[PDB]
Coordinates of all heavy atoms in Angstrom, one line a residue:
Chain I
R436 N 3.6 2.2 -8.3 CA 2.3 1.6 -8.6 C 2.6 0.1 -8.7 O 3.4 -0.3 -9.4 CB 1.8 2.1 -10.0 CG 0.4 1.9 -10.4 CD 0.2 2.2 -11.8 NE -1.3 2.0 -12.1 CZ -1.7 1.7 -13.4 NH1 -0.9 1.6 -14.4 NH2 -3.0 1.7 -13.6
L472 N -10.2 4.8 -9.2 CA -10.5 3.6 -9.9 C -10.5 2.4 -9.0 O -9.7 2.4 -8.0 CB -9.3 3.5 -10.9 CG -9.7 3.3 -12.4 CD1 -10.9 4.1 -12.9 CD2 -8.4 3.8 -13.2
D488 N -15.7 -4.2 -15.4 CA -16.0 -2.9 -16.2 C -15.1 -1.7 -15.8 O -15.3 -0.6 -16.2 CB -17.4 -2.5 -16.0 CG -17.7 -2.2 -14.6 OD1 -17.1 -2.8 -13.6 OD2 -18.8 -1.5 -14.3
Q489 N -13.9 -1.9 -15.2 CA -13.0 -0.8 -14.8 C -11.6 -1.1 -15.1 O -10.8 -0.3 -15.3 CB -13.1 -0.5 -13.2 CG -14.4 0.2 -12.9 CD -14.4 0.8 -11.5 OE1 -13.5 1.5 -11.1 NE2 -15.2 0.4 -10.7
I490 N -11.3 -2.4 -15.4 CA -10.0 -2.9 -15.6 C -9.5 -2.3 -17.0 O -8.1 -1.9 -17.0 CB -9.9 -4.4 -15.6 CG1 -8.4 -4.9 -15.5 CG2 -10.5 -5.0 -16.9 CD1 -7.8 -4.4 -14.2
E491 N -10.3 -2.0 -17.9 CA -9.8 -1.5 -19.3 C -9.4 -0.1 -18.9 O -8.3 0.4 -19.5 CB -11.0 -1.5 -20.3 CG -10.4 -1.3 -21.7 CD -10.2 0.3 -22.0 OE1 -11.0 1.1 -21.3 OE2 -9.4 0.7 -22.8
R492 N -10.1 0.7 -18.1 CA -9.6 2.0 -17.7 C -8.3 1.9 -16.9 O -7.5 2.8 -17.2 CB -10.6 2.6 -16.9 CG -11.9 3.2 -17.7 CD -12.0 4.7 -17.2 NE -13.4 5.2 -17.1 CZ -13.7 6.4 -16.9 NH1 -12.9 7.3 -16.6 NH2 -15.0 6.7 -16.9
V493 N -8.2 1.0 -16.1 CA -6.9 0.8 -15.3 C -5.7 0.7 -16.2 O -4.7 1.4 -16.0 CB -7.0 -0.4 -14.4 CG1 -5.6 -0.6 -13.7 CG2 -8.1 -0.2 -13.3
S494 N -5.8 -0.1 -17.3 CA -4.7 -0.3 -18.3 C -4.4 0.9 -19.0 O -3.3 1.0 -19.6 CB -5.2 -1.4 -19.2 OG -6.1 -0.9 -20.2
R495 N -5.3 2.0 -19.0 CA -4.8 3.3 -19.6 C -4.7 4.4 -18.6 O -4.6 5.6 -19.0 CB -6.0 3.6 -20.7 CG -6.0 2.8 -22.0 CD -7.2 3.0 -22.7 NE -7.9 4.3 -22.5 CZ -9.0 4.5 -21.9 NH1 -9.7 3.4 -21.5 NH2 -9.4 5.7 -21.6
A496 N -4.7 3.9 -17.4 CA -4.6 5.0 -16.2 C -5.7 6.1 -16.4 O -5.4 7.3 -16.2 CB -3.2 5.6 -16.3
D497 N -6.9 5.7 -16.9 CA -8.0 6.7 -17.1 C -8.9 6.7 -16.0 O -9.9 6.0 -15.9 CB -8.7 6.3 -18.4 CG -9.8 7.2 -18.7 OD1 -9.9 8.3 -18.1 OD2 -10.7 6.9 -19.4
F498 N -8.7 7.5 -15.0 CA -9.4 7.6 -13.7 C -10.7 8.3 -13.9 O -10.9 9.2 -14.7 CB -8.5 8.2 -12.6 CG -7.4 7.5 -12.2 CD1 -6.2 7.4 -13.0 CD2 -7.3 6.8 -11.0 CE1 -5.1 6.7 -12.7 CE2 -6.2 6.1 -10.6 CZ -5.1 6.0 -11.6
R499 N -11.7 7.9 -13.1 CA -13.1 8.4 -13.1 C -13.1 9.5 -12.1 O -12.4 9.4 -11.1 CB -14.1 7.4 -12.8 CG -13.7 5.9 -12.9 CD -14.8 4.9 -12.6 NE -15.4 5.3 -11.2 CZ -15.1 4.7 -10.1 NH1 -14.2 3.7 -10.1 NH2 -15.6 5.1 -9.0
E500 N -13.9 10.6 -12.3 CA -14.1 11.6 -11.4 C -15.1 11.0 -10.3 O -16.1 10.5 -10.7 CB -14.6 13.0 -11.9 CG -14.5 14.1 -10.9 CD -15.2 15.4 -11.4 OE1 -15.4 15.6 -12.6 OE2 -15.4 16.3 -10.5
Chain U
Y19 N -21.2 2.4 -12.8 CA -20.2 1.4 -12.5 C -20.6 0.6 -11.2 O -19.8 -0.2 -10.8 CB -18.9 2.1 -12.1 CG -18.2 2.6 -13.4 CD1 -18.3 4.0 -13.8 CD2 -17.5 1.8 -14.2 CE1 -17.7 4.4 -14.9 CE2 -16.9 2.3 -15.4 CZ -17.0 3.6 -15.7 OH -16.4 4.1 -16.9

Side-chain angles (χ1 to χ4, degrees):
Chain I
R436 190 189 187 201
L472 230 37
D488 63 334
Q489 287 188 57
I490 199 61
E491 192 279 329
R492 279 234 212 186
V493 173
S494 73
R495 285 168 27 244
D497 177 20
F498 297 72
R499 341 177 311 259
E500 190 184 341
Chain U
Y19 287 97

